[PDB]
Design a protein around this ligand. Structure first.
Ligand code: NI
Ligand code: NI
Ligand code: NI
Ligand code: NI
Ligand code: NI
Ligand code: NI
Ligand code: NI
Ligand code: NI
Ligand code: NI
Ligand code: NI
Lengths: 76, 104, 104, 76
């Protein structure tokens, strides 16, 4: 079964998306400000289990619109 | 911009291939250009190594380069080519047109 | 330098994957870095689209970018990972180590 | 059957190589001087048939060391 998720990423063809789980990915490159991506996830569920680092944080959930307005924090 | 399929028309005359490619004069080969910034989107079917390599590039750019946008499935085209001066019809000229891009 | 396989050790702790990867602490994932300058060498198994795209990049860099160095065959590794707190043994974790590079 | 060819390219693990045909490829990028590559060829024989352009010239032969000290010219 799938779930509807908030889509706020460059690969979003609409405000919502349907996937196996909802994702919030907080990514920080070496130079610029961290960007917060929201969307769904169907492959590589193991990304959700990664401990937050200084550069990446993976949040995942499978409730309806559970990834909406969820703020993540990176490691120092 | 992000990794996606870009239109790219190849004129066989302007690459010297019209000497043996009788027809067509050209074709839409397309092109996969764009950056593979993390997270690697699923529609680009990123492999686990590409995802890992993208994570190390975030840690520091010196150790690992960023995942690259490359064609993942290629489609054949039909050409008319000279076979020892003889115009022959090849139905599937494999690996010519891009149908799917990805991050590898 | 040219497209070739470069050693790249991944420390699972430094990418946050040690939370679920019990063993090994890391592995040699390798990396395909280097430029795919024309002519594209045959040991990098370049496709016909990659060869064509490399030819248009020579005509003018604005129309088509250069072919990219990416992994072409990936090898699995064996890991010990937590399955709901249980240390389980996965024999083939596919798509983790680079065995062959190429230009696509 | 294969043939021995002069190898003078960045991908040469020795002075000679064995392939179906010998190659001399004269490549010119947009900025720097044209480089002359010598080696063998087993795939994409159709590259040999390409008419010389302002940026690339493909020479091919299948004699013993036939691609040795062969000078190519590009188009204006
Ligand atoms: Ni998992
Ligand atoms: Ni695409
Ligand atoms: Ni062209
Ligand atoms: Ni990035
Ligand atoms: Ni994979
Ligand atoms: Ni290699
Ligand atoms: Ni690392
Ligand atoms: Ni080049
Ligand atoms: Ni091909
Ligand atoms: Ni041919």
């Amino acid at each position: 079964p799938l779930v509807t998720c908030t889509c706020e990423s460059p690969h979003c063809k609409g405000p919502t998306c349907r996937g196996a789980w909802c994702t919030v990915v907080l990514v920080r490159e070496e130079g610029r400000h961290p960007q917060e991506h929201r969307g769904c996830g169907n492959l590589h569920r193991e990304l959700c289990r990664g401990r937050p680092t200084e550069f990446v944080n993976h949040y995942c959930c499978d409730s309806h619109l559970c990834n909406h307005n969820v703020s993540l924090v990176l490691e120092a | 911009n992000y990794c996606k399929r870009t239109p790219l028309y190849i004129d066989f005359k302007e690459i010297g291939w019209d000497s043996w490619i009788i027809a067509p004069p050209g074709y839409e080969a397309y092109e996969c250009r764009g950056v593979c910034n993390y997270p690697l989107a699923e529609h680009l079917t990123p492999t686990k190594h590409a995802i890992i390599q993208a994570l190390v590039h975030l840690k520091n750019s010196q150790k690992a380069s960023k995942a690259c946008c490359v064609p993942t499935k290629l489609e054949p085209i039909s050409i008319l080519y000279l076979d020892k001066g003889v115009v022959t019809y090849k139905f599937k000229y494999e690996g010519m047109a891009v149908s799917e891009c990805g991050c590898r």
